[PDB]
Design a protein around this ligand. Structure first.
Ligand SMILES: [K+]
Ligand SMILES: [K+]
Ligand SMILES: [Mg+2]
Ligand SMILES: [Mg+2]
Ligand SMILES: [Zn+2]
Ligand SMILES: [Zn+2]
Lengths: 468, 468
DNA sequence: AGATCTCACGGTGGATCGAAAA
DNA sequence: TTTTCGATCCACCGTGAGATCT
DNA sequence: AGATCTCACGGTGGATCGAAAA
DNA sequence: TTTTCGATCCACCGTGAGATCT
């Protein structure tokens, strides 16, 4: 009847951030100018919001938290995709797989001191290996569906109590049905920030190799994501600790350092290298940490690899080995798609330049796995790079959470307030609703080490400053 | 061509508080839905704003202040009124008078610590005594044009330096011409808050009477407003000081108190009445003030008249005299239109109940003028009651100033910022532009003393809590 | 003058209500 | 009937001008 | 853990620019 | 010509996530 559909009227409601009274006025005014069939009455817009929700049985809201049954959320996402974003029925026998990434991050909105929200982004819906639907900007907030948020300051224990809880549900989800087709989900925990990567890093030690025990005949199990994490989660820490273990057994060339009078001069050179490094960058070193052993944070480990040349010249290690390690890792966490065949040979060349040069130190299982087997993961799981929502993108999500809470929630009760915030986080991330944003300006294209560009494929849309 | 005029598109721009990017998106979206002739392109909306401004020669903006030549502002207001709000040419010989109130108030927005803005509201445009245009809500912000604002914390000296400056311009303004008619302005300084009324109260003493020297043959000059102020500005103070002078010469019944041993017991009873009043209300009394003599603020004088009964029973004065004074003043500052014939006789009855009862105290020129001649002013000048913008209305003006400064001003430069704020304060107060607001809820109708209702005519639209 | 206590109100979107259409 | 749609209601609460106070 | 320094970016509406129509 | 109209530019700056620090 009218011109605006109730589904695109909603897109106008959200792109303009209009409030209920503002939209009712926007309708009534342009009704009084005579033009009658322009916008739907807010009753219809509500009805149209009602289609974007999961059924009320699976969304539970409390004064502190709001969570959606992951199964129902995925069912809803698939339902929307098939409803509108396809020319349907062109695939009636083919097998249907929806590949999706997920994660979580805590924000500090300056009680509602901080929010710990789990998010899920469907990346790709594939029919029998062939692409039906893609996510046009997989590093932007336009499809970041919520799973749960809670007003609990992010701690280490809550992250574990959330990962185990979400994984015990990922294992249980059976495929979701829609208009006769049966779609199966493939979830990858990829939207992991830095400090959460540190918190979950508790895989401290393993056998010589679960796979290698050289042949690869020991197969791979991919569910629950544990491998990708333990292998390449960001990794950045467990290579730097081993490089430091080399940097202290350097004068003596022995891995089992219980030999004659070594440990004391090990600690003495440990003190000297640490003095010179605290001199040149004013950054602390691995020396002592209370939990899980002596370690460092990634916010220092990045500067460890920022100038591989200088740290290697000061620590007494080869420049080019640290350069190539800073290249292989800066290709993992670059956020750009990884050219797997090239990366396999670069990792091989690095493993060689390492072991043909360093034999007195034997390869720990973490450095064994990043180089010898790390390249296989990006191919076998075809993962989006370890990147998660952009700097600007995560800022947009957090700013819009604050906005939905302050200006667009009903103050009748606390539960109604989180209900509004959640059922707006769902609308504003629907795969149906066209919902515009202010045009982004071009950034300087992020520079990486020269050997990384040959490693990546730089046709993508992503504009981070600190972390992609 | 299109449906929305560039003049009503602006009304939609302001009623919805849309930003330039929001309006451009609102146009483009509903253009992509096919409907082409709905809104004007923002170029046209700018062109339509250009008509609401005074010519650029008379608006001067500085990093601190922004002021409009009052003459040009009134010319613009008359131009708008005649352009659109009339069925024109029905009055080609009649004489045209535009009656307008004005004032100023400082606000403290929590450097831009406070703003001191002068405002002007056209109330009534009259043709040869007959009404052509009225202000539908003369106590609401919908027509409050700005004259000047400045980021200077409101002090006593700036208010005087502004009143003299504005009055030296009101005296100089010649009538404004539009479409062949010649309209003459009649300005009344009525939008005066409480503390500004105190600041301007510096008319301390005069002769026995400028008019009465009983016959009224000494005529009235009405320009520059000085009379209305000195007579009834709010008045509230100069009657209470005289009532206190009575309350201390009470035991002795002598006005010239240089008599035998009186002054000391005058001060002693002064101390006793002050003790009992500081006991019952915990409010200080006139006793000592540094400037212009011993005085009080109106925020205490209102509680002086709040319960006339108790203060009179404690101070030793007649209940009914203070009751009738609290009635005559609460009819002056009630904010409702004053039924002049009834008020004349009530003032006469009060003057009688005062002087037939109190002769030993002679009438000071302020109490002489409020009662004997005060009733004539409201008739001769036909003033709106001393009320100024409502509590909710002034809150709306200050909140919208804050909004225009924060969200709807360009940050390119400080002068551009005040330019935006001012040329939005002008648009949002134009007599042409239909600009809607959220519907106000009904308040409890303000209660006054029983004798005031017979004094006023309560058909009006005004909803103050503290001060109309 | 400058600081704090008070406290009535603008604003939030769904839930209900009641006509009125389909 | 069953939907559509405007007018209120829900309850809180951030805010900002008045009031009181040092 | 909790606090502060840093610092690149979203957002503001008119001023200019350049085609493109009237 | 003279207007219309979209795409940038103007310069700041409040804000909010990272980084550094106790
Ligand atoms: K108020
Ligand atoms: K940022
Ligand atoms: Mg994080
Ligand atoms: Mg004031
Ligand atoms: Zn292995
Ligand atoms: Zn007189």
């Amino acid at each position: 009847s009218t011109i605006f559909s109730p589904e695109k009227a909603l897109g106008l409601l959200l792109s303009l951030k209009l409030s209920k009274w503002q939209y009712i006025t926007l309708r009534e005014t342009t009704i009084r100018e005579g033009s009658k069939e322009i916008y739907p009455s807010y009753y219809k817009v509500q009805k149209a919001k009602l289609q974007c929700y999961p059924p009320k049985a699976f969304v539970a809201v409390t004064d502190s938290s709001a969570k959606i049954a992951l199964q129902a959320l995925l069912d809803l996402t698939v339902n929307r995709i098939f409803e509108t974003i396809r020319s349907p029925d062109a695939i009636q026998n083919k097998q249907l797989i929806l590949i999706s990434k997920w994660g979580f991050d805590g924000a500090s909105n300056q009680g509602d001191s901080s929010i710990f929200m789990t998010s899920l982004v469907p990346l790709k819906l594939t029919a029998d290996g062939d692409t039906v639907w893609v996510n046009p900007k997989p590093c932007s907030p336009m499809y970041c569906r919520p799973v749960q948020f809670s007003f609990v300051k992010e701690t280490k224990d809550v992250v574990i109590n959330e990962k185990t809880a979400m994984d015990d549900e990922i294992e249980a989800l059976v495929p979701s049905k829609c208009q006769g087709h049966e779609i199966s989900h493939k979830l990858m925990m990829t939207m992991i920030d830095g400090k959460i990567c540190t918190y979950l890093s508790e895989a401290k030690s393993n056998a010589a190799c679960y796979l290698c025990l050289l042949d690869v005949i020991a197969s791979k199990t991919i569910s629950s994501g544990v491998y990708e994490f333990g292998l390449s989660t960001l990794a950045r820490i467990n290579v730097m600790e081993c490089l430091l273990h080399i940097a202290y057994r350097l004068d003596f060339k022995k891995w089992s350092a219980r030999g004659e009078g070594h440990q004391e001069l090990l600690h003495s050179r440990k003190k000297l290298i640490q003095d010179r490094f605290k001199d040149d960058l004013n950054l602390l070193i691995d020396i002592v940490k209370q939990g899980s052993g002596t370690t460092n944070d990634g916010n220092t480990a990045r500067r460890f690899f920022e100038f591989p040349d200088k740290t290697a010249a000061i620590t007494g290690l080869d420049e080019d080995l640290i350069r190539r390690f800073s290249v292989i890792l800066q290709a993992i966490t670059s956020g750009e798609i990884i050219d797997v065949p090239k990366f396999k040979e670069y990792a091989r060349t690095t493993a060689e330049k390492y072991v043909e040069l360093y034999d007195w130190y034997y390869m720990s299982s973490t450095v064994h796995k990043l180089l010898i087997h790390g390249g296989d993961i990006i191919a076998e799981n075809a993962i989006v790079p370890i990147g998660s929502l952009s700097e600007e993108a995560s800022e947009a999500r957090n700013k819009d959470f604050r906005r939905f809470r302050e200006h667009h929630s009903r103050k009748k009760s606390r539960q109604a307030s989180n209900e509004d915030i959640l059922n707006m986080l769902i609308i504003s991330s629907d795969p149906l609703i066209s919902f515009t944003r202010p045009k982004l300006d071009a950034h300087k294209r992020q520079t990486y080490f020269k050997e990384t560009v040959e490693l990546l494929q730089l046709q993508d849309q992503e504009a981070p400053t600190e972390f992609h």
